[PDB]
Design a protein around this ligand. Structure first.
Ligand SMILES: CC(=O)N[C@H]1[C@@H](OP(=O)(O)OP(=O)(O)OC[C@H]2O[C@@H](n3ccc(=O)[nH]c3=O)[C@H](O)[C@@H]2O)O[C@H](C(=O)O)[C@@H](O)[C@@H]1NC(C)=O
Ligand SMILES: CC(=O)N[C@H]1[C@@H](OP(=O)(O)OP(=O)(O)OC[C@H]2O[C@@H](n3ccc(=O)[nH]c3=O)[C@H](O)[C@@H]2O)O[C@H](C(=O)O)[C@@H](O)[C@@H]1NC(C)=O
Ligand SMILES: O=c1ccn([C@@H]2O[C@H](COP(=O)(O)OP(=O)(O)O)[C@@H](O)[C@H]2O)c(=O)[nH]1
Lengths: 359, 361
């Protein structure tokens, strides 16, 4: 009668995916949901705020693990999570995205014969030296069910020999989340007011990929280029804390003061900032998709994206950070462009399709 | 001057590492660092192999073992990462498909250190086996894949792994059997010491978790061997977990009914295998080694990875569901031989492997 579905989350974007899935599982006939918070993101603005603003139940467990190496965090999450599984003995383990928490989750589970579904499965950058590419490859090959958000993602899984009956194209749960919480963003966020921004009167930026922040010359290119764009149109930049650290350590802190630099914001503010921006500059997966949701033109500061359909639809554009001025002009150019009318990522009911396929 | 750090953990890994490290010591500039995870620690599981196979002492003993999958794998992952940051090697070599293997590749790969997997591409197609998980994730984490068979090649291709990263080299355990044969022949007195002639017994090993962690399955086996014993003597070097399980379930008595030994060394094991009438096992290595010595095998599992042994009729599966049938299967196969065919290479898999590591750039 009752199925127990246990969710493993560690990072900001995982909390947001999980919020959408929880909603559907909460009001499901006979589903008990258990939520593990691995402790990977711990601060109030990377964690707590999302549980409160997206009405996510308090986690049944907080493993309190973070701030170490790949080896440390993965190893200790692996042991801790296994401990919890051995206690809760759930039917399904759900993991999301592609951090060390995603992998430790799946790997703890498969060795206990516990079914694993990967929510957001089959994305590839095809650069195997990326920790997130390894994480999503090893996760997919260890899961039993694979919830693909796009046709590309499906063909990626088939090509690595994963059979069709274990793959379900269900669209993207972060589109679910945008729809269902959009109205709540409307009535609660007052961030345009707090920062004194007129709608479509600024650009929005996020930057945190390690290939971008650990390399001094790439990070300088990016912060120079954003400061230049500020002169022409204000830049709002909720700065990931790792990015903040790396900028401070390489002595690029002045560029941040030269734009509208923020600590990280909750999802409601973010929606409200994403919605009312003229253009979005990012290296985030979630935010590139989100720009497209609101038909705001996007520039992705990478050599590739896993969300290729956004490039084909002309709503997103690649701009590797080789040159500061080159990147600035690319950003200012793409502001007066737009993509085609097209539906991606589904109807808003990816989460409900997931719940279905799990009974 | 290239550094190659090996990660080993258990009996079959030391046998594989021995064959390979013999070639790496002979190679100009090439320094080795050997890491022992501590997964096997009893002397007849570990130190004996180091002594008889002429393997230098490990540069590190992490002394992790005897916990859960999570505990072992997790603690190994952190520990091996710590070493790798110390030694910053150019290659990490991992072997087979223990939890040690996986902790190895996972440590290495997130540090952007190239990983090579010795014995790559094997698949049982049973994810209930912790070792099916281990080789799948290892192979997907590796930059070189030293497949031992054409099956293992094809397996890797179908999981969308590029042809350039896959080399078929044969099996280093064949290099081992070949290199150490004279020394076991000359130094093993195991036959004398038991009181056995050639062709006059049956040799048996059993340690698959899926056999030992289920009582009525283990009962099936122990009894099946006890019956066989009454007809042809059964020599049975017992794995420690197998013994401790036999005790946990109260099947102890069954081991009296055959020639139960503690675990033997490779030298003694070679002679036992060489001079047996039939081998029966749930072991990876022993299956192939039976074929090496042209001795019929029975494999007490639902599947094997070594499917070529079945097709050549050197091997036969018999899942343990019924004491009586398992015994009869065994006694029938005792009368069989497979076809003459050459598997697993020319005995120089280690040389090919060494070659490929040096010339990889
Ligand atoms: C490149 C890469 O691997 N990326 C993976 C990565 O996610 P990601 O890169 O998007 O990191 P991230 O940008 O912090 O989150 C965005 C969210 O934060 C919100 N967001 C952002 C900033 C902010 O101040 N406030 C806020 O609410 C935004 O509104 C938005 O909803 O980890 C994810 C995970 O494991 O689940 C994977 O799904 C991703 N994989 C992919 C393929 O996109
Ligand atoms: C089924 C499975 O996953 N198996 C994997 C597993 O090895 P395995 O099943 O063969 O365990 P094992 O039987 O302890 O050792 C045999 C050796 O011990 C010697 N041996 C055996 C008994 C004895 O008393 N004395 C002795 O010297 C024998 O002469 C023989 O040389 O770990 C291996 C590893 O990670 O490298 C993987 O390569 C294997 N994968 C495969 C696919 O064979
Ligand atoms: O030298 C050794 C190695 C293993 N074990 C036993 O084997 C169990 C599990 O061994 P492991 O998980 O390493 O797997 P194996 O490949 O030996 O089955 C441990 O809890 C020990 O009780 C032992 O007694 N001595």
């Amino acid at each position: 009668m009752w199925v127990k579905i246990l969710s493993v989350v560690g990072a900001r974007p995982q909390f947001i995916k999980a919020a959408a899935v929880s909603r559907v599982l909460r009001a499901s006939p006979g589903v008990r949901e258990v939520l593990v918070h691995t402790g990977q993101h711990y601060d109030d603005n990377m964690s707590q705020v999302f549980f409160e603003e997206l009405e996510i139940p308090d986690p049944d467990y907080h493993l309190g693990i973070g701030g170490g190496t790949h080896g440390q965090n993965t190893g200790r999450m692996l042991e801790a999570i296994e401990g919890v599984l051995l206690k809760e003995k759930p039917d399904w383990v759900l993991v999301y995205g592609n951090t060390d928490s995603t992998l430790a989750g799946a790997l703890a589970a498969v060795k206990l014969h516990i079914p694993v579904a990967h929510v957001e499965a089959g994305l590839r950058s095809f650069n195997r030296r990326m920790p997130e590419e390894i994480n999503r490859i090893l996760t997919d090959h260890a899961s039993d069910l694979l919830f693909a958000p796009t046709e590309t993602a499906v063909q990626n899984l088939l090509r690595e020999g994963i059979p069709e009956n274990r793959i379900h194209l269900v669209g993207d749960v972060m589109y679910d989340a945008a729809l269902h919480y959009g109205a709540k963003a409307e009535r609660k966020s007052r961030i345009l007011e707090r920062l004194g921004l007129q709608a479509k009167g600024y650009v929005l930026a996020t930057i945190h990929r390690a290939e971008n922040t650990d390399d001094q010359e790439r990070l300088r290119v990016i912060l120079e280029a954003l400061a230049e764009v500020h002169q022409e149109v204000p830049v709002v930049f909720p700065v990931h804390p790792r990015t903040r650290k790396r900028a401070e350590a390489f002595g690029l802190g002045s560029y941040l003061e030269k734009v509208v630099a923020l600590e990280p914001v909750g999802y409601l503010d973010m929606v409200m900032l994403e919605k009312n921006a003229r253009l979005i500059v990012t290296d985030s997966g979630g935010v590139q998709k989100e720009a497209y949701f609101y038909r705001v033109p996007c520039v992705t500061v990478r050599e590739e994206t896993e969300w290729v359909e956004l490039l084909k639809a002309e709503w997103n554009y690649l701009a590797a950070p080789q040159n500061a001025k080159d990147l600035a002009l690319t950003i200012l150019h793409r502001m007066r462009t737009k993509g085609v009318e097209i539906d991606l990522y589904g109807d808003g009911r990816a989460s409900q399709k997931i719940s279905d396929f799990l009974r």
